[PDB]
């Protein structure tokens, strides 16, 4: 059971190369099923989900080999089933459905259930396929989609904005016969990257990143080389690491435009920010951060995923700042951990009232949420003494070797195996 | 088109006989498909929906006829599908699905378009069935249910309280193998009625009316005679009719226990209400009504179906009273009409601030909503001069010949053809 | 820093007598400021708040004493101010305001000023008093209320259900001229109890319990003897204590009607329950509980103060159960604690998915919330080994001798002082 | 009763000069009370509310005059109370409180109010002034704010986001001692515009337009010349005007940066848009508009104030488009009116499903909503034949002689008294 042991305090400064987004990576990987010719997917991160996806693809009859990139060859997909084993460890596995039926005319995914009716996330995917002409079948712990020939483009009005369903409906429509319109499509930067990847293979797609995606079906998708987009939330994690440490840092392999709100936010905190075509720089100028007010909201507004980070920023900032969760519920569960470290805070309703203190004190902390967990490793860096972040496997799922990045930044971090 | 011409103002008084609730009759008629013996359903109102349910049952090979009662003998049922024409003009038709598969092993109902993804009402039905072990098929614009042998009892958790879905599950479970339990069950008097009907056939149901329904499957269901409960909304409409005119009315063939919230509210308005086994008396003593404070909510709370009626009550009462909607958005269609009738009111988000006025004035009015429309006709009754409600066809579908009832109360009503 | 050291597993069983509710004794204790003649308030618990209230009444010039009953003589209330010192620790102190201005024409309570403008609790109190005629001054961290003569009855429409405001408005209405009507009043048993106390004093109150309370002002209130109703939550806590341990328990000095929702829920879990006039019996018959579905909501529905307790129930119950919080957000702190005890659950939004395990393990836990903390103690009672609940003072402020009662029940529990 | 008589179809094209934004003018007019020196507010529209504000100001002792500009000299305010007679028709009048108390230590604004407490819009203002150290006096029908000397800078956290309160708190903080921080401040362009005004008078303000506004109190405010910002909603109405008629239009006196979401939206509809620092041009190139998907949301997202307008666009555009009211309820009352003109649409809960038709047809129409009404006048413009919009005084209260502008644009419009 891996743990992080940190020596504080350490000023975070220097350089960090942002990894590719697991979130753009996943759906792009599934979409690669559409390709007739080989595909090179670059800038893919090394995370559990990528591996599970690799296993899944190979199992469909796909040729898969990885490194910096992942080499996909979907020319010989023979099997059409996503087994129980694979689709229980990873929700994203639902994405195999659409391509399979769009390109092969058939597909089946395992169906973990037991739960509440009218709840299932998959419900949106299934109905999306149904509107496309696919024949759905709910049997044998399964969900089967099939069509004779091509899928039919349709005008689809989304009732609930859904990242997952937008990818499935969009992907499957590239091969559909006719035009498909997705009303209320997810705006996420990841959706845009997936659209672009599709466009690169030969698909005709437009409106990506807006409330309306329009797909013009084509007969087939080729191959080629595509670069997965940088990790927006990771960038924000390192940007915050300098902002709370009086540091100066430059973010390489970054994508500024996917960070508008976090940048404006960092500025409010009195940070000297600069951006280039592919990089972002933050200079605290030895200064202490200025407490900010935060309101999480749907993209392109303040990302909820950057919430715990900002809560830490307010925690070691000059003055008071209140963070509000416009969206979610129960996202503060990690705060008490911070309190045990010398942080002054009041969880009130859907908000967290932040009372900035000069210096945090090392301690024993644990958070299961990846963001909240990473926020803890950050605190250890600026706290006085020794901090132990427990159960970092959580972090590993979403962070490509973070201790290494933090170390190059000057952090006194150490991966402690088997306690 | 057929319109109504009322002569105001007249005091609505005397008696009215309450019709059977179309809403209970509906699922009951469908449930009769489970009956292995002839079934006589008493007290069924003469409405469009009933005719259509009949057309539908006959086309399954069911022996049906009607007068005050609807006779059903599902002895020669050889057809297992509800064709498009039927389902289109009546959403309730999804009700044939559960019984068909529960009793015969198979069943298919038509499925129209439009219903945005994640906003389809039938979604809950497909789900409940699937939980019972049914194989589901979404092909040909059809929703298909089939099972090998009997349906399997299950412990289902309702994500959202659904009247339709609760009826479908409860029904299918009566023929299932083992026990079925519905968490978050809709509590509607209508559901209770359908349960009572099933028990009359020999089903084993309990908890009907509460948030939790328990069904123990049995081998077969018999036959018998069943009286459909009185229409609660109808009774409420007539209670208000007198409430807003100093009159005294006695509703016959009524069911007091289904009117808790409405009866209480009426007392608040200053009404002298009395009740018996099967009747309800309301006396204004020539008195004008008092503005009340209404908040709609799930049964047994204040019914949204009584909403428009009460706005009318406030609009002619003493004082200011706010009416708040928490169920239906856009259910304020009547207000603009009542305004044009001399009423003063302000609409704020999901409420209506009413400012009572002594008298109303005739006018050409129109509302597409069943309840608003019937409310308009009421308005015309106490309004000054001549009032004309267009498109009354909406009222015809939910109200069993309302003119004869209003006329019988001292009203100056009059249907009008041509247009 | 008091600690609870529990030795599990121990089957909770036998008998426990329920204390008076702190939450009824508080508003009633304040209402006593209305009585011109001596008063006896029976069944008042021995808790921090009761002491702070007593001290407050004493400062006002009231002769105050206690044991089981609290003796009060407010015949000579000579001081009209509640200073910072006396109120810093107790929000309920706002209750001194209404009584003071209704009987004496002047009153003032200290306002700790940290609130976020918009959600400030006294807001409703201030508003109702004003609707009653009182002049309100917000000066010197003091909330001031004055009136030349008597308060004037009024029709008050509650914009938000407020147990606080409701009590303040109800209480003062008793001494005002004419009638007062509170639309949207809080329905809490505690409010009914406060009302009963008022009527017992010669007040004219009807509607308590419902959403519409009518008060008929009188001239003076006399004296008399009054019995505070039993603590519904405490009872619920003891009821669940057995339910989770296979035990049988008889709650003495209880009141079954305040527990409709909680009793029906226990039955769902498989408890053999029986009630009397002042008692409730719960028998598990040696059986482990059955997972249940819980949706909190405004009284008379499932109580949010029972939440944590029912979560514990589900976590060691048979199957998967769901707990949904509609009342408060951020009320899941107990979950991560219990999870450290061997429990299995996922927190999704306003809900917690429960996966009942057979046995729990002793661990070091802590919850700042009253209920969560008590829940941890019950967990420890049924967990294998030694559990240590830190910060038990939270429990101390709310439960009368929790340790004794649990002890008499079979628990192996000890108060560890100063760690 | 004024009506708009419109003969269509006609192509709207040419030039229009955007008037001053009523929403920024009102708050500045009030802020002018802080100025010890003659001030000239330019670009003020000729609207009913302005006239009311002027009267209120004169009634205070302020020398007031107007044309395009409103000349103000409040170096000698003598009457510290806004009377019932003046405030009776304008909520905005609550804005006199802040300046009155910050500058002269006392203010009294009359309040009208039937019943019901909590809510009330003024709540926020009264409480904010209190956080600043103002002594508030509350008696039904009025609110008095006083302070002995200067107000004291404070840290205020808004529980609810309020345009009104933000102006009151931001304004009265300019004269206070120390710093006042407003967490959760409204971000509207008008808040930014009001703030800029204060800065032009010597105020120290930063953050306007973001979630956190910070004010550094100064000794006094001066005078000068200031220009109210263009009317964003007005500009939107004019763009759509050409956008739905196939015409081309240039908006003079515009401020492009307050229209990001609407500009992008029009671009989606296929409009060819260009902009300058103070102009905006729209060219359909004789082309019919493209159906778009619209999600209204808080600034700077798609403005709910632009919705009715956009719905019109969809109703005569090519294809299907859905408009969702993400925040506000019952925002579609006007739709029926448009359907009466030949529109094809469905109102589903919080959304409108648009089916673009070729040509609308004249008809008698009415809407109370400012924007909705303005939508109908536009529809007349493009519809076939004669359209009669009743109750246009609504349009009169927010638009600076729309009839005139529409005429120069090529419309056949006429202000008439009867059908």
Short mmCIF file of N, CA and C in Angstrom, two decimals, chain D residues 111-200:
data_model
loop_
_atom_site.label_atom_id
_atom_site.label_comp_id
_atom_site.label_asym_id
_atom_site.label_seq_id
_atom_site.Cartn_x
_atom_site.Cartn_y
_atom_site.Cartn_z
N UNK D 111 -41.25 51.70 2.00
CA UNK D 111 -41.42 50.35 1.50
C UNK D 111 -42.88 49.92 1.42
N UNK D 112 -43.30 49.37 0.27
CA UNK D 112 -44.69 48.93 0.19
C UNK D 112 -44.58 47.41 0.36
N UNK D 113 -45.63 46.73 0.78
CA UNK D 113 -45.50 45.28 0.92
C UNK D 113 -46.67 44.53 1.53
N UNK D 114 -47.41 43.78 0.74
CA UNK D 114 -48.57 43.14 1.33
C UNK D 114 -48.44 42.10 2.44
N UNK D 115 -47.72 41.04 2.18
CA UNK D 115 -47.47 40.09 3.24
C UNK D 115 -46.42 39.02 2.87
N UNK D 116 -45.92 38.30 3.84
CA UNK D 116 -44.94 37.32 3.52
C UNK D 116 -43.54 37.83 3.70
N UNK D 117 -42.75 37.07 4.42
CA UNK D 117 -41.48 37.52 4.83
C UNK D 117 -40.43 36.49 4.54
N UNK D 118 -39.20 36.97 4.40
CA UNK D 118 -38.13 36.15 3.93
C UNK D 118 -38.31 36.44 2.48
N UNK D 119 -37.37 36.09 1.63
CA UNK D 119 -37.49 36.67 0.35
C UNK D 119 -37.17 38.11 0.53
N UNK D 120 -38.17 38.94 0.29
CA UNK D 120 -38.15 40.32 -0.09
C UNK D 120 -36.85 40.74 -0.68
N UNK D 121 -36.91 41.42 -1.80
CA UNK D 121 -35.69 41.83 -2.45
C UNK D 121 -34.90 42.78 -1.58
N UNK D 122 -35.56 43.78 -0.98
CA UNK D 122 -34.83 44.74 -0.17
C UNK D 122 -33.97 44.11 0.95
N UNK D 123 -34.34 42.92 1.41
CA UNK D 123 -33.60 42.19 2.45
C UNK D 123 -32.08 42.34 2.33
N UNK D 124 -31.56 41.96 1.18
CA UNK D 124 -30.14 42.04 0.91
C UNK D 124 -29.50 43.40 1.12
N UNK D 125 -30.16 44.44 0.62
CA UNK D 125 -29.69 45.82 0.76
C UNK D 125 -29.58 46.23 2.23
N UNK D 126 -30.66 46.05 2.98
CA UNK D 126 -30.70 46.40 4.40
C UNK D 126 -29.57 45.70 5.18
N UNK D 127 -29.43 44.40 4.97
CA UNK D 127 -28.39 43.64 5.64
C UNK D 127 -26.95 43.97 5.25
N UNK D 128 -26.76 44.35 3.99
CA UNK D 128 -25.44 44.72 3.51
C UNK D 128 -25.01 46.02 4.16
N UNK D 129 -25.92 46.99 4.20
CA UNK D 129 -25.64 48.28 4.83
C UNK D 129 -25.30 48.06 6.30
N UNK D 130 -25.91 47.04 6.89
CA UNK D 130 -25.66 46.70 8.27
C UNK D 130 -24.25 46.17 8.48
N UNK D 131 -23.79 45.34 7.56
CA UNK D 131 -22.44 44.79 7.65
C UNK D 131 -21.42 45.93 7.62
N UNK D 132 -21.82 47.04 6.99
CA UNK D 132 -20.98 48.23 6.89
C UNK D 132 -20.98 49.07 8.14
N UNK D 133 -21.79 48.68 9.11
CA UNK D 133 -21.83 49.43 10.35
C UNK D 133 -23.00 50.37 10.51
N UNK D 134 -23.93 50.33 9.57
CA UNK D 134 -25.11 51.18 9.62
C UNK D 134 -26.12 50.68 10.66
N UNK D 135 -26.71 51.61 11.40
CA UNK D 135 -27.73 51.28 12.38
C UNK D 135 -29.04 51.27 11.62
N UNK D 136 -29.65 50.10 11.53
CA UNK D 136 -30.90 49.97 10.81
C UNK D 136 -32.12 50.01 11.71
N UNK D 137 -33.13 50.72 11.25
CA UNK D 137 -34.40 50.81 11.95
C UNK D 137 -35.49 50.23 11.05
N UNK D 138 -36.16 49.20 11.55
CA UNK D 138 -37.22 48.54 10.80
C UNK D 138 -38.64 48.59 11.33
N UNK D 139 -39.52 49.20 10.56
CA UNK D 139 -40.95 49.26 10.88
C UNK D 139 -41.75 49.03 9.62
N UNK D 140 -42.66 48.07 9.63
CA UNK D 140 -43.46 47.82 8.43
C UNK D 140 -43.83 49.02 7.57
N UNK D 141 -43.29 49.04 6.36
CA UNK D 141 -43.58 50.14 5.46
C UNK D 141 -42.41 51.10 5.27
N UNK D 142 -41.29 50.83 5.94
CA UNK D 142 -40.11 51.67 5.82
C UNK D 142 -38.84 51.07 6.41
N UNK D 143 -37.70 51.60 5.99
CA UNK D 143 -36.40 51.16 6.49
C UNK D 143 -35.52 52.39 6.59
N UNK D 144 -34.91 52.58 7.75
CA UNK D 144 -34.03 53.72 7.96
C UNK D 144 -32.64 53.24 8.27
N UNK D 145 -31.66 53.84 7.62
CA UNK D 145 -30.27 53.47 7.83
C UNK D 145 -29.52 54.68 8.32
N UNK D 146 -28.89 54.54 9.47
CA UNK D 146 -28.11 55.63 10.00
C UNK D 146 -26.71 55.29 10.51
N UNK D 147 -25.83 56.28 10.51
CA UNK D 147 -24.50 56.04 11.00
C UNK D 147 -23.91 57.31 11.56
N UNK D 148 -23.24 57.16 12.69
CA UNK D 148 -22.60 58.26 13.36
C UNK D 148 -21.17 58.44 12.82
N UNK D 149 -21.06 59.20 11.74
CA UNK D 149 -19.77 59.44 11.12
C UNK D 149 -19.70 58.67 9.82
N UNK D 150 -18.61 57.94 9.61
CA UNK D 150 -18.43 57.14 8.41
C UNK D 150 -18.80 55.67 8.58
N UNK D 151 -19.07 54.99 7.47
CA UNK D 151 -19.37 53.56 7.53
C UNK D 151 -18.05 52.84 7.68
N UNK D 152 -18.09 51.62 8.20
CA UNK D 152 -16.85 50.86 8.35
C UNK D 152 -16.64 49.71 7.36
N UNK D 153 -15.56 49.78 6.58
CA UNK D 153 -15.26 48.73 5.62
C UNK D 153 -15.42 47.35 6.23
N UNK D 154 -16.05 46.43 5.49
CA UNK D 154 -16.29 45.08 6.00
C UNK D 154 -16.10 43.98 4.96
N UNK D 155 -16.01 42.74 5.46
CA UNK D 155 -15.86 41.56 4.61
C UNK D 155 -17.24 40.89 4.47
N UNK D 156 -17.88 41.13 3.33
CA UNK D 156 -19.22 40.60 3.11
C UNK D 156 -19.30 39.45 2.13
N UNK D 157 -19.90 38.36 2.57
CA UNK D 157 -20.05 37.19 1.71
C UNK D 157 -21.50 37.04 1.33
N UNK D 158 -21.82 37.18 0.05
CA UNK D 158 -23.20 37.05 -0.42
C UNK D 158 -23.70 35.62 -0.53
N UNK D 159 -24.74 35.29 0.23
CA UNK D 159 -25.32 33.95 0.16
C UNK D 159 -26.00 33.77 -1.19
N UNK D 160 -26.62 34.85 -1.67
CA UNK D 160 -27.28 34.89 -2.96
C UNK D 160 -26.63 35.98 -3.82
N UNK D 161 -26.51 35.75 -5.12
CA UNK D 161 -25.92 36.75 -6.01
C UNK D 161 -27.01 37.79 -6.31
N UNK D 162 -26.74 39.05 -5.99
CA UNK D 162 -27.72 40.10 -6.22
C UNK D 162 -27.25 41.38 -6.92
N UNK D 163 -27.75 41.63 -8.13
CA UNK D 163 -27.39 42.84 -8.85
C UNK D 163 -27.72 44.03 -7.94
N UNK D 164 -28.94 44.05 -7.41
CA UNK D 164 -29.36 45.14 -6.54
C UNK D 164 -28.42 45.38 -5.37
N UNK D 165 -28.23 44.35 -4.55
CA UNK D 165 -27.38 44.44 -3.37
C UNK D 165 -25.94 44.79 -3.70
N UNK D 166 -25.42 44.25 -4.80
CA UNK D 166 -24.04 44.54 -5.18
C UNK D 166 -23.88 46.04 -5.40
N UNK D 167 -24.86 46.66 -6.06
CA UNK D 167 -24.77 48.11 -6.28
C UNK D 167 -24.85 48.91 -4.96
N UNK D 168 -25.76 48.51 -4.08
CA UNK D 168 -25.93 49.19 -2.80
C UNK D 168 -24.69 49.06 -1.93
N UNK D 169 -24.16 47.85 -1.83
CA UNK D 169 -22.97 47.61 -1.02
C UNK D 169 -21.69 48.21 -1.61
N UNK D 170 -21.49 48.04 -2.92
CA UNK D 170 -20.33 48.62 -3.61
C UNK D 170 -20.33 50.16 -3.55
N UNK D 171 -21.52 50.74 -3.60
CA UNK D 171 -21.67 52.19 -3.56
C UNK D 171 -21.39 52.83 -2.21
N UNK D 172 -22.03 52.31 -1.18
CA UNK D 172 -21.88 52.84 0.17
C UNK D 172 -20.54 52.49 0.79
N UNK D 173 -19.79 51.61 0.14
CA UNK D 173 -18.50 51.22 0.67
C UNK D 173 -17.42 52.21 0.22
N UNK D 174 -17.72 52.97 -0.83
CA UNK D 174 -16.77 53.92 -1.38
C UNK D 174 -16.43 55.05 -0.41
N UNK D 175 -17.37 55.37 0.47
CA UNK D 175 -17.19 56.42 1.47
C UNK D 175 -16.83 55.90 2.86
N UNK D 176 -16.81 54.58 3.00
CA UNK D 176 -16.49 53.95 4.26
C UNK D 176 -15.01 53.96 4.62
N UNK D 177 -14.72 53.63 5.87
CA UNK D 177 -13.35 53.57 6.37
C UNK D 177 -12.76 52.18 6.22
N UNK D 178 -11.67 52.10 5.46
CA UNK D 178 -11.03 50.82 5.26
C UNK D 178 -11.50 50.15 3.99
N UNK D 179 -11.35 48.84 3.95
CA UNK D 179 -11.74 48.09 2.78
C UNK D 179 -12.98 47.21 2.95
N UNK D 180 -13.75 47.12 1.88
CA UNK D 180 -14.93 46.28 1.89
C UNK D 180 -14.76 45.31 0.72
N UNK D 181 -14.91 44.02 1.01
CA UNK D 181 -14.79 43.01 -0.03
C UNK D 181 -16.16 42.38 -0.22
N UNK D 182 -16.58 42.22 -1.48
CA UNK D 182 -17.87 41.61 -1.78
C UNK D 182 -17.70 40.27 -2.47
N UNK D 183 -17.82 39.18 -1.71
CA UNK D 183 -17.71 37.85 -2.29
C UNK D 183 -19.02 37.46 -2.95
N UNK D 184 -18.93 36.88 -4.14
CA UNK D 184 -20.13 36.50 -4.86
C UNK D 184 -20.89 37.65 -5.52
N UNK D 185 -20.21 38.77 -5.73
CA UNK D 185 -20.81 39.94 -6.35
C UNK D 185 -21.35 39.64 -7.74
N UNK D 186 -22.42 40.34 -8.10
CA UNK D 186 -23.01 40.19 -9.42
C UNK D 186 -21.92 40.62 -10.39
N UNK D 187 -21.91 40.01 -11.57
CA UNK D 187 -20.91 40.29 -12.59
C UNK D 187 -21.42 41.07 -13.80
N UNK D 188 -22.72 41.34 -13.84
CA UNK D 188 -23.28 42.08 -14.96
C UNK D 188 -22.48 43.28 -15.48
N UNK D 189 -22.52 43.51 -16.80
CA UNK D 189 -21.80 44.64 -17.40
C UNK D 189 -22.16 45.96 -16.73
N UNK D 190 -23.41 46.06 -16.29
CA UNK D 190 -23.90 47.24 -15.60
C UNK D 190 -23.26 47.40 -14.22
N UNK D 191 -22.87 46.30 -13.58
CA UNK D 191 -22.19 46.42 -12.29
C UNK D 191 -20.81 47.02 -12.59
N UNK D 192 -20.18 46.54 -13.67
CA UNK D 192 -18.87 47.02 -14.11
C UNK D 192 -18.97 48.50 -14.48
N UNK D 193 -20.06 48.84 -15.16
CA UNK D 193 -20.30 50.21 -15.56
C UNK D 193 -20.56 51.16 -14.41
N UNK D 194 -21.29 50.69 -13.41
CA UNK D 194 -21.58 51.51 -12.23
C UNK D 194 -20.27 51.75 -11.48
N UNK D 195 -19.51 50.67 -11.29
CA UNK D 195 -18.23 50.72 -10.61
C UNK D 195 -17.30 51.73 -11.30
N UNK D 196 -17.20 51.65 -12.63
CA UNK D 196 -16.35 52.58 -13.38
C UNK D 196 -16.72 54.03 -13.15
N UNK D 197 -18.01 54.27 -13.02
CA UNK D 197 -18.55 55.60 -12.74
C UNK D 197 -17.99 56.13 -11.42
N UNK D 198 -18.10 55.31 -10.38
CA UNK D 198 -17.60 55.65 -9.06
C UNK D 198 -16.09 55.94 -9.10
N UNK D 199 -15.35 55.14 -9.86
CA UNK D 199 -13.92 55.32 -10.01
C UNK D 199 -13.63 56.67 -10.66
N UNK D 200 -14.46 57.06 -11.62
CA UNK D 200 -14.29 58.33 -12.30
C UNK D 200 -14.56 59.49 -11.34
#
